[PDB]
Amino acid sequence: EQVKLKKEISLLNGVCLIVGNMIGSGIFVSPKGVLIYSASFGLSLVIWAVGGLFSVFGALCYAELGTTIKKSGASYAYILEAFGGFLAFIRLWTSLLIIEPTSQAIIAITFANYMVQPLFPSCFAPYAASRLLAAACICLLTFINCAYVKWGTLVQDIFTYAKVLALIAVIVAGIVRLGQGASTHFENSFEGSSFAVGDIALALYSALFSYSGWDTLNYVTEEIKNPERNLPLSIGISMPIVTIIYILTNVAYYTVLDMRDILASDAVAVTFADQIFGIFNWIIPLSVALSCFGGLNASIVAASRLFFVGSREGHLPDAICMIHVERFTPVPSLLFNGIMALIYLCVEDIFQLINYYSFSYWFFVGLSIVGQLYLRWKEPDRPRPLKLSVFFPIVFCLCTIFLVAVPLYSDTINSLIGIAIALSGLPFYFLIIRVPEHKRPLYLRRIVGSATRYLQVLC
Ligand SMILES: N[C@@H](CCCC[NH3+])C(=O)O
């Protein structure tokens, strides 16, 4: 009965946090980032499959890591127990300022856009709506996750079911248009491609960037029923599902659209629909909005638990490690994440904020893998229920080196401002965190007063 974040995330709610968070407005809108560089369908599908394989290697690394550690945080519990503190600190701080607020605000804006879109198919949706609809979405998901976490897993479940239904719809349309005929785009000179170290590297980067989120279940891993089984099994059931969904929906696309109008189109699914569904060409913008809703709910669960864990370790203020008394949901962490996402709804060029945290994000996943190897070396006696091999940590450490080098020479000043964000986090750690609580002024008294006032949100 004691205040503890009860588990209540089954295997199904495990597969829905990963699949949900993963397939979101990635293959729905301009997924041709792997087609611009691999200028052919055959090479495009080969690079989809290869990026999927390498994301599977990363997800198996994280299954082993999350069954080894059994602490939520998913990049912050694996840097904190392998390395120490400071690096974990600037992983919560990068996720606190730039990574999680921006990603949630962008998913909210992209949900608003494609909710409104069937009304404004050619005209661009206004900036007044498509930001107020985004704030309504963020606030609704924060409230749904703040009331009952079973509600939050339910929302995630429903909208992941919607995602998979819509993508099965487009995949079925593609297979139909392939069986009846219409196989000109496919299997005929399929690979008049652009084999080149630059182009192949950038297409692999775009694919491996498109399967992100495989580490979403690891954020909520103190709340899984028997994590030892349900975390690796849910990851290993989610990753082939999402890889298959990706390569099949791209097959469909290529079968219907063409190399020309599949580029130079804003949201290629909303092009595919216009070519096939006809009068029901609004279903696909509706499904992009639903998939963005599922992805936003998963981002909110994961970010709320990242900040909760971060404050439980002493990094974020105590007020953020607090459960609700009767509902058992991290109310102050969720309010904080919602505050941050809504603040980042006021920014105009947020899709420009993407790239800083892009480099930093893959850096931190890499540092977590490096920490897994550090633990394999230093403590080869910790109970690891699922210990696969070293081959997967090694290959995905290499793939992380690649995914970190690509945005460091392509656009370097942005990644430098990302490192600047982490450096800006540094002073709080070297001046507030590392203080042993008995050197701070009556700022402590203010902090405790505020923490009590916010304790008056659980009662
Ligand atoms: N992978 C999702 C984004 C969620 C990953 C977490 N930042 C996408 O492809 O759009």
UniProtKB/Swiss-Prot annotation:
Principal localisation: membrane
Any one GO molecular function term: L-arginine transmembrane transporter activity
Consequence of substituting residue 358 to R: In LPI; failed to induce cationic amino acid transport activity
GO biological process, one term: L-arginine transmembrane transport
Bilayer disposition of the protein: Multi-pass membrane protein
Protein's cellular compartments: Basolateral cell membrane
Gene3D superfamilies: Amino acid/polyamine transporter I
InterPro entries documented for this protein: AA/rel_permease1, AminoAcid_Transporter
Induction field: Expression is stimulated and enhanced by IFNG/IFN-gamma.
Annotated effect of mutating residue 26 to V: In LPI; failed to induce sodium-independent cationic amino acid and sodium-dependent neutral amino acid transport activity; does not affect heterodimerization with SLC3A2; affects expression level
Effect of residue 160 to I: In LPI; failed to induce cationic amino acid transport activity
Glycosylation sites: 297
Transmembrane segments: 9-29, 41-61, 79-99, 105-125, 132-152, 158-178, 194-214, 231-251, 276-296, 355-375, 388-408, 413-433
Cellular component per GO, a single term: basolateral plasma membrane
One Pfam family cited in the UniProt record for this chain: AA_permease_2
Keywords of the record: Amino-acid transport, Cell membrane, Disease variant, Disulfide bond, Glycoprotein, Membrane, Osteoporosis, Phosphoprotein, Transmembrane, Transmembrane helix, Transport
Tissue-level expression: Highest expression in kidney and peripheral blood leukocytes. Weaker expression is observed in lung, heart, placenta, spleen, testis and small intestine. Expressed in normal fibroblasts and those from LPI patients. Also expressed in HUVECs, monocytes, retinal pigment epithelial cells, and various carcinoma cell lines, with highest expression in a colon-carcinoma cell line.
Catalytic activity line of the entry: L-leucine(out) + L-arginine(in) + Na(+)(out) = L-leucine(in) + L-arginine(out) + Na(+)(in); L-leucine(out) + L-lysine(in) + Na(+)(out) = L-leucine(in) + L-lysine(out) + Na(+)(in); L-leucine(out) + L-ornithine(in) + Na(+)(out) = L-leucine(in) + L-ornithine(out) + Na(+)(in)
Subunit field text: Disulfide-linked heterodimer with the amino acid transport protein SLC3A2/4F2hc.
Function: Heterodimer with SLC3A2, that functions as an antiporter which operates as an efflux route by exporting cationic amino acids from inside the cells in exchange with neutral amino acids plus sodium ions and may participate in nitric oxide synthesis via the transport of L-arginine. Also mediates arginine transport in non-polarized cells, such as monocytes, and is essential for the correct function of these cells. The transport mechanism is electroneutral and operates with a stoichiometry of 1:1. In vitro, Na(+) and Li(+), but also H(+), are cotransported with the neutral amino acids.
PANTHER family according to UniProt: AMINO ACID TRANSPORTER (PTHR11785), Y+L AMINO ACID TRANSPORTER 1 (PTHR11785:SF303)
Clinical disorder: Lysinuric protein intolerance: A metabolic disorder characterized by increased renal excretion of cationic amino acid (CAA), reduced CAA absorption from intestine, and orotic aciduria. On a normal diet, LPI patients present poor feeding, vomiting, diarrhea, episodes of hyperammoniaemic coma and growth retardation. Hepatosplenomegaly, osteoporosis and a life-threatening pulmonary involvement (alveolar proteinosis) are also seen. Biochemically LPI is characterized by defective transport of dibasic amino acids at the basolateral membrane of epithelial cells in kidney and intestine.
Family statement: Belongs to the amino acid-polyamine-organocation (APC) superfamily. L-type amino acid transporter (LAT) (TC 2.A.3.8) family.
Designated name of the protein: Y+L amino acid transporter 1
Naturally occurring in which organism (per UniProt): Homo sapiens (Human)
